Design a protein around this ligand. Structure first.
Ligand SMILES: CC(=O)N[C@@H]1[C@@H](O)[C@H](O)[C@@H](COP(=O)(O)O)O[C@H]1O
Ligand SMILES: CC(=O)N[C@@H]1[C@@H](O)[C@H](O)[C@@H](COP(=O)(O)O)O[C@H]1O
Ligand SMILES: CC(=O)N[C@@H]1[C@@H](O)[C@H](O)[C@@H](COP(=O)(O)O)O[C@H]1O
Ligand SMILES: CC(=O)N[C@@H]1[C@@H](O)[C@H](O)[C@@H](COP(=O)(O)O)O[C@H]1O
Lengths: 190, 190, 190, 190
């Protein structure tokens, strides 16, 4: 039986397991240090391709709203941003495989300029994991072929979402003020 | 206690409940009809803003890969696409509130041209729900303020992901061929 | 003297010469045939990177408004679209160098699927020019280093703009109706 | 006669006149002050919709390459960035009409936060011109209906291109270093 109800139930379980297996790997002490490193960044570049780029943009929209300076989709433009990073800036490199040439190149360029590279990647030995100062692991679990990318994205978002909440915690008043101003402005477009 | 471990556990539960409550509302017979309507569309426009736009782009990348003609982010460009739709085309309008003026306007324009409007929206009585030919419900559950948008996105993706798998089912051989050709091409960029 | 007034005068002359030298190469009989090929395309993909991608998006917004089905920035997504093109579809490949691996790969994939490839590229012997069924030449002229990309873009837009006007000519009534509907809709967002 | 050769000749003249009439309005002393204000900005947001957004992105890619921190297309995201600007940051608001509600709202929000607003807009009395600290004028000239948007874009790019060259002048060594690093990186993707 391959009914839509069976598919929905199986996919929700696949996503639950990706959330569980990804969370199980977290080093929470080290995650807090990563959050503080991001909070001090004068500029943050989030890199990625495909679904990983969308995960990165989803985080970027929230970071922008709460006041971070965040760099877009074009891989060659991304390379130009990476070479312009400076000491204290942060690159968040989102790549499940950790082996996309464009993302590896941007991580190499950012590190060479003295920026801090934080990789969000699968639990595998990749060029990106070898370049990053810190790596946060994303595990999709054993997925069915039709839903591999969706469960991967679920795992990736579980990490970026936690980064966002941790950043809100460090600057709660300003975050609340900026959320309120943002809501007031967009409500004027109704 | 507001430790990162507590936050992660609570957020994963919030997401599990959003998946559960969204799936519980599905009419699976009607979902199959919606999937078949999409499968016959000569052109599909996916509309949305903010996080809903990212959910839509995530679905769009997968639909493009398996051969669908899919329309981008600019709300005024979206309006120009909506007025150019024709009978048989489909608009998938993704808006949790269902009350963003730009999205409502695009749905009105698409319907006027004879296109089919499928809304993906919260369980509320909105202008978008009143304009759509079919509505699929997305329920975030009762969320904490720091994670409301993330659990909403989880619920939205649960619906779009099911649409994707249902579309693969209807054209499995061609979908597999296109996935293979796509993988071969992108591997050449390694 | 490197005053802003001198810079502005020199840049305007550089752009005038790029328009002139690009127009001088046009084969107008062959351009009309290219326009008719585009007008018959059930689906059009416009590929490019960097500034060439922006030139392509500028054309795409206008084509969408007048009713064409047009495919975005992600180079790996572009590859997935190219492999899904069919006989009768058109790829407009915009690349000044004609040697960006991603664009060459997409042109190869489109041609393999039977689609028609129209290259918009510099007057040089490139892999893209060798793959295209038709090539339209864009000449920047001899540019100063600070403005090379701007004069290149001016030349590229001179070709795409002519394609747009030629397409309006072939379907003038429908184009006017769609422009009016588009204007009416966007004015409602004022 | 409405041949493609006649169209091309007329469009090139229309563009030449837009460059001429836009340049004729420049106050070069005030332009130099605007360039210096931009050069000191810790963060620059470029706003716009439609073709104006593409003009802004074209400038943004160049500014990013030479080291500026630059904010994207979503109008509601743009609003969230505008409310997060600070004293010393710059908003470059590109809108020919100067009356798009989204752009006016972002300019109001940026000014309220103490940021400097530079408008690039038509020679008309608009809400945006009334909000901006500095306005640079873009004149399309008297255009034919089929090419109004293209000549407008030509005029807009003439202003942004001059801003870019002026910024290169103020930091020539660093600009050259960053151009070289950028070229070396992207050549590795060949
Ligand atoms: C046809 C294909 O496989 N496209 C893939 C796409 O699915 C994938 O999301 C993207 C990014 O991958 P990553 O997370 O860096 O490992 O890389 C593209 O190449
Ligand atoms: C500052 C704010 O509230 N921005 C919101 C953004 O969070 C939200 O994702 C976007 C779309 O909303 P919808 O799903 O259509 O109800 O609408 C914007 O206005
Ligand atoms: C640092 C650099 O050179 N970036 C370039 C960018 O300027 C250029 O617009 C883009 C596309 O080039 P093309 O028109 O295909 O020859 O390719 C990037 O690599
Ligand atoms: C159907 C239509 O008119 N779309 C327009 C588009 O052509 C235009 O580029 C965009 C921005 O205008 P602006 O430069 O701010 O005056 O505003 C949209 O509404």
């Amino acid at each position: 039986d391959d009914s839509l109800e069976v598919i929905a139930r199986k996919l929700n379980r696949e996503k639950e397991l990706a959330l569980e297996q990804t969370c199980a790997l977290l080093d929470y002490a080290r995650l807090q240090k990563i959050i503080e490193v991001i909070s001090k960044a004068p500029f943050i570049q989030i890199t990625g391709l495909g679904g990983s780029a969308l995960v990165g943009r989803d985080l970027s929209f929230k970071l922008m709203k709460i006041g971070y300076r965040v760099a877009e989709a074009d891989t060659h433009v991304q390379a130009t941003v990476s070479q312009a990073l400076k000491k204290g800036d942060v690159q968040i490199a989102i790549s499940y495989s950790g082996s996309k040439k464009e993302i590896v190149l941007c991580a190499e360029a950012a590190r060479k300029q003295g920026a801090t590279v934080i990789a969000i990647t699968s639990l595998t030995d990749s060029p990106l994991r070898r370049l990053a100062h810190f790596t946060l692991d994303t595990v999709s679990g054993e997925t069915e072929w039709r839903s591999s990318s969706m469960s991967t994205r679920t795992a990736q978002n579980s990490v970026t979402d936690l980064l966002f909440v941790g950043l809100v915690q460090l600057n709660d008043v300003e975050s609340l003020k900026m959320i309120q101003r943002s809501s007031e402005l967009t409500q004027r477009l109704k």
